[PDB]
PDB file of C-alpha atoms in Angstrom:
ATOM      1  CA  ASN A 693       2.994  10.179   1.257  1.00 48.56           C
ATOM      2  CA  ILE A 694       1.762   7.765   4.011  1.00 44.82           C
ATOM      3  CA  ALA A 695      -1.591   6.530   2.668  1.00 46.56           C
ATOM      4  CA  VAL A 696      -0.143   3.405   1.104  1.00 48.10           C
ATOM      5  CA  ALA A 697       1.302   2.493   4.483  1.00 50.19           C
ATOM      6  CA  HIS A 698      -2.161   2.806   5.919  1.00 48.82           C
ATOM      7  CA  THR A 699      -4.273   1.089   3.284  1.00 46.47           C
ATOM      8  CA  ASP A 700      -1.883  -1.487   1.884  1.00 46.50           C
ATOM      9  CA  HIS A 701      -0.314  -2.610   5.233  1.00 44.38           C
ATOM     10  CA  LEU A 702      -2.014  -1.508   8.479  1.00 43.12           C
ATOM     11  CA  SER A 703      -5.382  -2.509   7.043  1.00 46.43           C
ATOM     12  CA  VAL A 704      -4.325  -6.138   7.059  1.00 48.70           C
ATOM     13  CA  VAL A 705      -3.323  -5.709  10.696  1.00 49.66           C
ATOM     14  CA  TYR A 706      -6.887  -4.664  11.395  1.00 49.18           C
ATOM     15  CA  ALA A 707      -8.253  -7.521   9.292  1.00 51.41           C
ATOM     16  CA  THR A 708      -6.371 -10.125  11.293  1.00 51.80           C
ATOM     17  CA  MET A 709      -6.866  -8.457  14.643  1.00 50.16           C
ATOM     18  CA  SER A 710     -10.574  -8.603  13.958  1.00 52.84           C
ATOM     19  CA  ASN A 711     -10.391 -12.415  14.032  1.00 50.44           C
ATOM     20  CA  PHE A 712      -8.595 -12.528  17.389  1.00 50.27           C
ATOM     21  CA  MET A 713     -10.226 -14.757  19.976  1.00 50.48           C
ATOM     22  CA  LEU A 714     -11.060 -12.005  22.451  1.00 50.40           C
ATOM     23  CA  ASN A 715     -12.397  -9.265  20.185  1.00 51.34           C
ATOM     24  CA  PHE A 716     -15.892 -10.669  20.652  1.00 53.90           C
ATOM     25  CA  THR A 717     -18.117  -7.575  20.360  1.00 52.60           C
ATOM     26  CA  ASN A 718     -19.413  -5.950  17.165  1.00 53.38           C
ATOM     27  CA  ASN A 719     -17.761  -2.535  17.558  1.00 50.49           C
ATOM     28  CA  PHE A 720     -19.142  -0.662  14.514  1.00 49.89           C
ATOM     29  CA  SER A 721     -21.108  -1.413  11.314  1.00 45.30           C
ATOM     30  CA  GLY A 722     -19.647   1.209   8.980  1.00 45.42           C
ATOM     31  CA  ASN A 723     -22.718   3.423   9.156  1.00 46.87           C
ATOM     32  CA  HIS A 724     -22.723   6.260  11.678  1.00 48.38           C
ATOM     33  CA  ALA A 725     -26.361   7.102  11.015  1.00 43.75           C
ATOM     34  CA  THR A 726     -27.851   3.878  12.296  1.00 42.41           C
ATOM     35  CA  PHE A 727     -25.277   1.943  14.302  1.00 42.06           C
ATOM     36  CA  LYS A 728     -25.856   1.244  17.981  1.00 40.33           C
ATOM     37  CA  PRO A 729     -24.043  -1.363  20.080  1.00 40.71           C
ATOM     38  CA  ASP A 730     -25.918  -4.530  20.991  1.00 42.47           C
ATOM     39  CA  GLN A 731     -26.501  -4.061  24.731  1.00 44.26           C
ATOM     40  CA  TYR A 732     -26.572  -6.777  27.334  1.00 45.21           C
ATOM     41  CA  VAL A 733     -26.978  -7.276  31.061  1.00 45.03           C
ATOM     42  CA  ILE A 734     -26.515 -10.117  33.432  1.00 43.83           C
ATOM     43  CA  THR A 735     -29.856 -10.017  35.250  1.00 45.69           C
ATOM     44  CA  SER A 736     -31.939 -12.039  37.688  1.00 44.84           C
ATOM     45  CA  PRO A 737     -35.510 -12.146  39.017  1.00 41.68           C
ATOM     46  CA  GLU A 738     -33.693 -12.025  42.346  1.00 40.80           C
ATOM     47  CA  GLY A 739     -32.874  -8.431  41.387  1.00 39.42           C
ATOM     48  CA  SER A 740     -29.311  -8.148  40.035  1.00 36.48           C
ATOM     49  CA  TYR A 741     -28.760  -5.843  37.038  1.00 35.66           C
ATOM     50  CA  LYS A 742     -25.304  -5.672  35.469  1.00 33.70           C
ATOM     51  CA  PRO A 743     -24.896  -3.896  32.104  1.00 32.85           C
ATOM     52  CA  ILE A 744     -21.830  -4.990  30.144  1.00 33.10           C
ATOM     53  CA  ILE A 745     -21.462  -1.589  28.555  1.00 32.92           C
ATOM     54  CA  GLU A 746     -22.095   1.268  30.944  1.00 32.14           C
ATOM     55  CA  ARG A 747     -21.067   4.874  31.284  1.00 34.36           C
ATOM     56  CA  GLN A 748     -19.119   5.598  34.458  1.00 33.66           C
ATOM     57  CA  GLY A 749     -16.825   8.374  33.203  1.00 30.70           C
ATOM     58  CA  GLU A 750     -13.029   8.446  33.416  1.00 32.90           C
ATOM     59  CA  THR A 751     -11.495   5.299  34.905  1.00 32.91           C
ATOM     60  CA  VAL A 752      -8.156   4.488  36.517  1.00 35.93           C
ATOM     61  CA  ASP A 753      -7.133   2.433  33.454  1.00 35.84           C
ATOM     62  CA  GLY A 754      -6.911   5.492  31.189  1.00 36.97           C
ATOM     63  CA  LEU A 755      -8.827   3.747  28.406  1.00 37.87           C
ATOM     64  CA  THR A 756     -12.014   5.800  28.638  1.00 39.39           C
ATOM     65  CA  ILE A 757     -10.852   9.267  27.565  1.00 38.47           C
ATOM     66  CA  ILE A 758      -9.626   9.737  23.992  1.00 35.65           C
ATOM     67  CA  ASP A 759      -7.165  12.415  22.837  1.00 36.37           C
ATOM     68  CA  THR A 760      -7.921  12.800  19.143  1.00 35.58           C
ATOM     69  CA  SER A 761      -4.734  14.845  18.688  1.00 34.54           C
ATOM     70  CA  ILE A 762      -3.031  11.467  18.289  1.00 32.18           C
ATOM     71  CA  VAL A 763      -3.867  11.749  14.596  1.00 33.64           C
ATOM     72  CA  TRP A 764      -1.238  14.457  14.067  1.00 31.87           C
ATOM     73  CA  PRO A 765       1.846  12.402  14.917  1.00 31.33           C
ATOM     74  CA  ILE A 766       0.405   9.586  12.823  1.00 33.16           C
ATOM     75  CA  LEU A 767       0.485  11.850   9.772  1.00 32.88           C
ATOM     76  CA  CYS A 768       3.247  14.341  10.365  1.00 34.54           C
ATOM     77  CA  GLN A 769       5.796  12.455  12.475  1.00 32.40           C
ATOM     78  CA  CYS A 770       5.761   8.654  12.106  1.00 33.45           C
ATOM     79  CA  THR A 771       7.766   6.330   9.848  1.00 35.95           C
ATOM     80  CA  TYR A 772       6.314   3.144   8.397  1.00 39.40           C
ATOM     81  CA  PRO A 773       7.853  -0.056   6.982  1.00 38.54           C
ATOM     82  CA  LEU A 774       6.274   0.709   3.611  1.00 38.74           C
ATOM     83  CA  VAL A 775       7.430   4.319   3.739  1.00 38.01           C
ATOM     84  CA  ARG A 776      10.196   3.839   3.411  1.00 36.37           C
ATOM     85  CA  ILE A 787      13.743   2.128   0.634  1.00 36.99           C
ATOM     86  CA  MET A 788      12.702  -1.532   0.935  1.00 39.83           C
ATOM     87  CA  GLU A 789      12.186  -3.055   4.391  1.00 40.02           C
ATOM     88  CA  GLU A 790      11.138  -6.612   5.287  1.00 40.31           C
TER      89      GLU A 790
ATOM     90  CA  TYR B 199      34.284 -19.304 -39.287  1.00 39.99           C
ATOM     91  CA  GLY B 200      32.989 -21.209 -36.286  1.00 39.06           C
ATOM     92  CA  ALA B 201      30.774 -18.454 -34.883  1.00 42.38           C
ATOM     93  CA  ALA B 202      28.349 -20.597 -32.917  1.00 42.13           C
ATOM     94  CA  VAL B 203      25.530 -18.098 -32.630  1.00 43.43           C
ATOM     95  CA  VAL B 204      24.912 -14.445 -33.550  1.00 43.13           C
ATOM     96  CA  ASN B 205      22.506 -12.270 -31.558  1.00 41.85           C
ATOM     97  CA  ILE B 206      21.256  -8.691 -31.945  1.00 42.81           C
ATOM     98  CA  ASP B 207      21.930  -7.108 -28.561  1.00 41.28           C
ATOM     99  CA  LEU B 208      21.496  -3.631 -27.138  1.00 43.39           C
ATOM    100  CA  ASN B 209      24.802  -1.777 -27.477  1.00 42.47           C
ATOM    101  CA  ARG B 210      26.687  -1.796 -24.183  1.00 41.66           C
ATOM    102  CA  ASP B 211      29.086   0.776 -25.622  1.00 40.48           C
ATOM    103  CA  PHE B 212      26.127   3.147 -25.918  1.00 37.85           C
ATOM    104  CA  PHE B 213      24.027   2.079 -22.959  1.00 40.28           C
ATOM    105  CA  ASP B 214      27.137   2.283 -20.800  1.00 40.64           C
ATOM    106  CA  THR B 215      27.298   1.627 -17.062  1.00 41.11           C
ATOM    107  CA  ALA B 216      27.105   5.433 -16.818  1.00 40.40           C
ATOM    108  CA  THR B 217      23.462   4.983 -17.881  1.00 39.84           C
ATOM    109  CA  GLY B 218      23.146   2.711 -14.845  1.00 36.52           C
ATOM    110  CA  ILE B 219      22.187  -0.119 -17.219  1.00 35.61           C
ATOM    111  CA  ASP B 220      23.561  -3.674 -16.938  1.00 35.35           C
ATOM    112  CA  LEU B 221      23.215  -5.452 -20.258  1.00 35.91           C
ATOM    113  CA  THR B 222      25.350  -8.552 -19.614  1.00 36.09           C
ATOM    114  CA  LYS B 223      22.249 -10.620 -18.822  1.00 37.70           C
ATOM    115  CA  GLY B 224      20.674  -9.866 -22.197  1.00 40.39           C
ATOM    116  CA  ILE B 225      18.171  -7.352 -20.861  1.00 37.17           C
ATOM    117  CA  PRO B 226      18.654  -3.831 -19.489  1.00 39.54           C
ATOM    118  CA  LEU B 227      18.732  -3.888 -15.672  1.00 35.57           C
ATOM    119  CA  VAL B 228      18.770  -0.626 -13.730  1.00 31.16           C
ATOM    120  CA  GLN B 229      18.961  -1.242  -9.988  1.00 31.57           C
ATOM    121  CA  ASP B 230      17.101   0.820  -7.388  1.00 31.15           C
ATOM    122  CA  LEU B 231      14.635   2.683  -9.612  1.00 33.80           C
ATOM    123  CA  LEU B 232      11.140   1.108  -9.674  1.00 34.46           C
ATOM    124  CA  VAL B 233      11.707  -1.114  -6.649  1.00 34.88           C
ATOM    125  CA  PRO B 234       8.504  -2.724  -5.162  1.00 36.08           C
ATOM    126  CA  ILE B 235       7.574  -2.324  -1.479  1.00 35.03           C
ATOM    127  CA  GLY B 236       6.348  -4.960   0.960  1.00 37.11           C
ATOM    128  CA  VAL B 237       8.113  -7.931  -0.557  1.00 37.14           C
ATOM    129  CA  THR B 238      10.920 -10.240   0.534  1.00 39.18           C
ATOM    130  CA  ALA B 239      14.482  -9.362  -0.455  1.00 40.35           C
ATOM    131  CA  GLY B 240      15.361 -10.494  -3.968  1.00 39.28           C
ATOM    132  CA  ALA B 241      11.804  -9.928  -5.191  1.00 38.32           C
ATOM    133  CA  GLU B 242      12.910  -6.513  -6.421  1.00 38.48           C
ATOM    134  CA  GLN B 243      14.926  -8.063  -9.257  1.00 37.65           C
ATOM    135  CA  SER B 244      12.265  -8.303 -11.974  1.00 36.74           C
ATOM    136  CA  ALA B 245      11.507  -4.582 -11.729  1.00 37.08           C
ATOM    137  CA  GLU B 246      15.110  -3.919 -12.705  1.00 36.20           C
ATOM    138  CA  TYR B 247      13.887  -4.928 -16.168  1.00 41.29           C
TER     139      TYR B 247
ATOM    140  CA  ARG C 940     -24.295  -9.600 -10.529  1.00 40.02           C
ATOM    141  CA  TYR C 941     -21.342  -7.331 -11.373  1.00 38.64           C
ATOM    142  CA  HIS C 942     -17.571  -7.196 -11.409  1.00 35.66           C
ATOM    143  CA  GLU C 943     -15.499  -4.498  -9.711  1.00 36.67           C
ATOM    144  CA  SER C 944     -12.362  -3.549 -11.676  1.00 39.16           C
ATOM    145  CA  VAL C 945      -9.813  -0.773 -12.186  1.00 37.87           C
ATOM    146  CA  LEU C 946     -10.084   1.582 -15.173  1.00 37.31           C
ATOM    147  CA  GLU C 947      -6.977   3.532 -16.189  1.00 36.85           C
ATOM    148  CA  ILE C 948      -7.374   7.138 -17.297  1.00 39.04           C
ATOM    149  CA  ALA C 949      -5.562   6.042 -20.461  1.00 37.37           C
ATOM    150  CA  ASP C 950      -8.488   3.643 -20.952  1.00 38.64           C
ATOM    151  CA  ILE C 951     -10.694   6.747 -21.019  1.00 40.10           C
ATOM    152  CA  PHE C 952      -8.795   9.822 -22.245  1.00 38.94           C
ATOM    153  CA  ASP C 953      -6.515   9.537 -25.281  1.00 39.80           C
ATOM    154  CA  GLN C 954      -5.135  13.036 -25.876  1.00 37.95           C
ATOM    155  CA  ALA C 955      -1.797  13.428 -27.649  1.00 37.34           C
ATOM    156  CA  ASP C 956       0.024  15.813 -25.288  1.00 34.40           C
ATOM    157  CA  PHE C 957      -2.161  15.272 -22.253  1.00 35.27           C
ATOM    158  CA  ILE C 958      -1.987  11.491 -21.725  1.00 38.56           C
ATOM    159  CA  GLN C 959       0.664   9.219 -23.212  1.00 39.53           C
ATOM    160  CA  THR C 960      -1.357   6.283 -24.499  1.00 40.42           C
ATOM    161  CA  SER C 961       1.194   4.583 -26.729  1.00 38.21           C
ATOM    162  CA  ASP C 962       0.805   0.802 -26.480  1.00 42.78           C
ATOM    163  CA  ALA C 963       4.535   0.711 -25.731  1.00 40.91           C
ATOM    164  CA  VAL C 964       4.176   2.912 -22.654  1.00 41.16           C
ATOM    165  CA  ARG C 965       1.021   0.979 -21.828  1.00 44.14           C
ATOM    166  CA  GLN C 966       2.705  -2.417 -21.724  1.00 42.32           C
ATOM    167  CA  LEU C 967       5.663  -0.842 -20.030  1.00 42.27           C
ATOM    168  CA  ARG C 968       3.293   0.198 -17.212  1.00 45.51           C
ATOM    169  CA  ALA C 969       1.764  -3.260 -17.359  1.00 45.72           C
ATOM    170  CA  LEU C 970       5.201  -4.488 -16.326  1.00 44.05           C
ATOM    171  CA  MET C 971       5.364  -2.143 -13.311  1.00 44.18           C
ATOM    172  CA  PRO C 972       4.953  -3.217  -9.667  1.00 45.55           C
ATOM    173  CA  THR C 973       2.138  -1.511  -7.788  1.00 42.65           C
ATOM    174  CA  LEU C 974       3.532   1.939  -6.964  1.00 41.14           C
ATOM    175  CA  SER C 975       3.178   4.457  -4.147  1.00 42.48           C
ATOM    176  CA  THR C 976       4.068   8.131  -4.583  1.00 43.62           C
ATOM    177  CA  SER C 977       7.193   7.586  -2.486  1.00 42.77           C
ATOM    178  CA  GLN C 978       8.265   4.931  -4.997  1.00 44.78           C
ATOM    179  CA  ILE C 979       7.631   7.266  -7.886  1.00 44.86           C
ATOM    180  CA  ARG C 980       9.669   9.922  -6.110  1.00 42.55           C
ATOM    181  CA  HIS C 981      12.398   7.360  -5.603  1.00 39.61           C
ATOM    182  CA  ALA C 982      12.375   6.579  -9.326  1.00 38.38           C
ATOM    183  CA  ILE C 983      12.721  10.218 -10.193  1.00 37.68           C
ATOM    184  CA  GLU C 984      15.519  10.623  -7.648  1.00 35.65           C
ATOM    185  CA  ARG C 985      17.278   7.624  -9.178  1.00 32.20           C
ATOM    186  CA  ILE C 986      17.039   8.924 -12.730  1.00 32.71           C
ATOM    187  CA  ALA C 987      18.399  12.219 -11.425  1.00 31.97           C
ATOM    188  CA  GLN C 988      21.179  10.303  -9.745  1.00 30.92           C
TER     189      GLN C 988
END
C-alpha cells in the first residue's frame, strides 16, 4: 500500500538531497560486505591528532543513538502525498 | 435534407449517465476511476478516456 | 552492452482463463497511467460506486 510512495516519490528526495552542498562525505556504497568510511584526521608533526569520524558514545545532540522502531510508524501509521485521491 | 454530417456514435441512451459515462465529447469519459498520481491538476483528464 | 526493459507477464504467459492477453485489453492497458495498488483499489471502488 505505501511502497509507491517510497520508491516513486521519496526516492527523488534522496536523489536531490544527495547533491546538496553540505552532504560532502560518501556515506555508503551499497555493499555491506566491503564498505568502510574513508577516514581522515587533521594532524601535525607538532603532535595534534584529530579524527573527523570518532566514536565517543551518546552525545548531547541526540544524533548518535538510533531507535530503529521508527520504521513501524513509517509503515503502519503515516500518510503520504502519493497515498492518497490526487494531491499536488 | 441538409444534414451536414452523419457520425456513428456510442449510444448515450444506453451508456447513460447512470453508467458514469460522458459521451458528449465523442469519447466515453468516466471521472475518478483510473486517475494518475503525482501530477498537476487537470492532468487526470486523459485517463477518463 | 545491453538494454534494461520491462516484460509483462502477458508477454510471457498466454493462457485463456489465466491471463487475458487479448490485443484489445493489451492496448487498453497501454493507455493506462502507471498504477499503484491504491489506484487499482480506487478503480474498483469507483466501479462499485
